[PDB]
């Protein structure tokens, strides 16, 4: 569009004779994702809700990718096996972690999903030391609305992360930035939806009050819904996992919709409220199995390519028969290198846009008890 | 710092023998803004406060800055005179334009102050038109904490803009974003502090309570102050600026801060509760000249240097004398062609580091009455 | 208003309150004024004559949702 072609008919609040006052007011009513944020980045984009994935990014690791490589975790692996609470299952292996990406990625291009790649500097280190976790770019997921800077709350190598994530976003995507948090704890990307309204978190210590409440306030007023809901379980662990039970900090190794009002949940996850929130809005619950889950095989963190259809871990075999017995289908990818640390294979994906989908509404309705 | 070299010391709240709890809880209980912000950063930022400021922004005008020269100004001059309401002075005189710019430049490196430079692309367009009001980089000004994506409540060329302001201050500064306001209208970058703690906004056609209330609650939580206030005027204005009364949308516009608990102030800007909550609090008020403001030469967009110590328009004989009876020295800079848009010399300066300075208990404890 | 509103004959009652910019009675400077006398007043059902000196935001929303008409007063008179 030439330069000198704009014309007042182009800003959308205009109209032959409208006053000051009212166009201001139509200014001040327009919705910020449609009028401002979506038009200036020139793109849609966010992975809220339950519908179908089009776009995720990866990180292809390099020996700095390695938490066990770390000098701090050298100097004591069992400050950070504190931390994170993840079984030992030994070094991790840099080329088997490669493949596994790799194979990751062919799963993407084999499902229509476009793949970006991030990588991090040579030696990349934050204030604090060398960074830990980074290749889990869950933790950078853009939302509607725009990407957020979080508070970890148990991983200092992930501090400057969320910051890298959601800058190389806005240089590389045009996708903004909608808020920092600032308190307390709150780690989003590590959430879930299993509606297009209704979010899961935890209180944990990757979670608490006051980090949620402002989460959820910056994402709420860019949802594009009218209602929004946030279920909060309240798992049993005091660092990341909690090796004795399969209970988790992270929503994403809690639970995950398998389809419209279907679950895929840990037996660690649900106290009674959550149960009861769920039974009363309609949900079905598929148990992951308890050995899967206690062992840290990550059979909850699965990916919702779109309702019906998700990649989980290959070695998950007994969680995904009972998904395909609930009518889904699975999508088979090795994930072993990635659980030598604090997540599995849905944790280390960015998504970056998701269609709208399905409503609370619609799980509400669908008949099947 | 050697990559190899980084030990648990490195972490601040790291010590020998800390549970997972006990570090997760000291983690969740630092402050963001000099635990994460800053050191991510590396180096402090913020304009809040009235302490002494070090370093700004200035946009250069090309042809393209030119408001008067937009296509849809071109298409209805009276639709922008009408959102904007400042007195017609004539077309912008791009040299003369271009000289009161470097002046300003002159002024702010006699004086110590760091000055950077934002240019726009050219043919610079937002999704509705050309880029208008894109000199005013005050619309940009960074916070303790990070950047503002603004909500614009009257100019529609600014879309875009305050991304762009932020985006330019992430990666040339590596200052972090930390809000986006989302709803009504909110341009904090035209407020102003009068104590370290004590904002003044609007309500106006530039400001609603609930985009004001998102501001407000985003920078108290990185102010780096105990407490935090704001006063809220309520100018008579349809638009920005109404030419009958002086009054208008922005409060840099209606007051500033000249020294510690010493206001420059507009006749029109103070109702019955701001006039007691400003006497309550013990600040002296200096009264601009009435004419100078209703006239629209800006008396009170003054720019603090430090307590004392302003730049002013040089053609506000009037105030600039009245502020030098009150003990501050006026640096006297040219600044015409730019009240020809809606903004005068504080208007246009992007304000990117001002050291901690006086306190509200400050300024109630100075004697003076 | 709670001594006028239970005499007022009417079911409801509304106060609109401005918030002029003025320090005694009268701002010679921009046409403000501590009366709402000297600020608006009605001419006919829904339309106003207001002084540019008048409203503020709220003011000027609230009368805009309740569909009063503003005929704005010359402001040199
Ligand atoms: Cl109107
Ligand atoms: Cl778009
Ligand atoms: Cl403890
Ligand atoms: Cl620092
Ligand atoms: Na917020
Ligand atoms: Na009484």
């Known amino acids: 569009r030439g330069y000198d072609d704009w014309r007042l008919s182009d800003i959308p609040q205009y109209k032959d004779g409208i006053s000051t006052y009212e166009f201001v007011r139509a200014t001040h009513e327009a919705d910020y994702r449609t009028h401002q944020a979506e038009p200036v980045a020139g793109r849609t984009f966010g992975f809220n809700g339950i519908g179908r994935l089009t776009e995720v990014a990866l990180h292809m690791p390099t020996r700095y990718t390695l938490h066990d490589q770390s000098s701090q975790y050298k100097e004591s692996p069992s400050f950070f096996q504190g931390l994170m609470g993840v079984p030992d299952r030994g070094p991790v292996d840099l080329a088997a972690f490669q493949r596994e990406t790799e194979e990751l990625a062919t799963a993407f291009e084999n499902n229509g999903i476009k793949v970006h790649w991030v990588d991090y500097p040579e030696e990349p280190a934050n204030p604090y ?79 608490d009050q006051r980090g949620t409440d402002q989460l959820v306030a910056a994402i709420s007023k860019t949802s ?9 379980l309240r798992p049993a662990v005091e660092g990341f996992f909690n090796k004795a039970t399969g209970a988790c900090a992270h929503p994403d190794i809690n639970i995950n919709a398998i389809d419209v009002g279907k679950l895929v949940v840990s037996p660690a996850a649900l106290d009674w409220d959550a149960r009861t929130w769920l039974y009363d809005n309609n949900f079905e619950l598929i148990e992951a199995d308890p050995d899967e889950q206690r062992e840290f095989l990550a059979p909850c963190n699965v990916l919702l390519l779109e309702p019906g259809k998700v990649i989980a871990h290959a070695d998950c075999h007994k969680t995904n028969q009972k998904i395909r017995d609930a009518g889904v289908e699975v999508i088979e990818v090795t994930g072993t290198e990635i659980r030598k640390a604090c997540g599995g294979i849905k944790a280390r994906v960015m998504q970056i846009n998701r269609e709208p989908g399905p409503t609370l509404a619609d799980v509400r309705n669908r008949v099947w008890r």
């Open 129 to 207: 030391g060398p960074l830990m976790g980074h290749v889990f770019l869950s933790w950078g997921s853009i939302w509607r609305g725009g990407s957020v800077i979080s508070r970890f709350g148990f991983l200092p190598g992930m501090v400057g992360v969320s910051e890298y994530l959601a800058k190389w976003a806005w240089n590389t995507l045009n996708i903004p930035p909608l808020v920092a948090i600032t308190e307390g704890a709150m780690e989003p990307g590590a959430c879930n939806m299993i509606a297009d309204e209704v979010l899961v978190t935890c209180l944990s210590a990757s979670y």
């Open 224 to 232: 594009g819904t009218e209602e929004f809901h946030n279920l909060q």
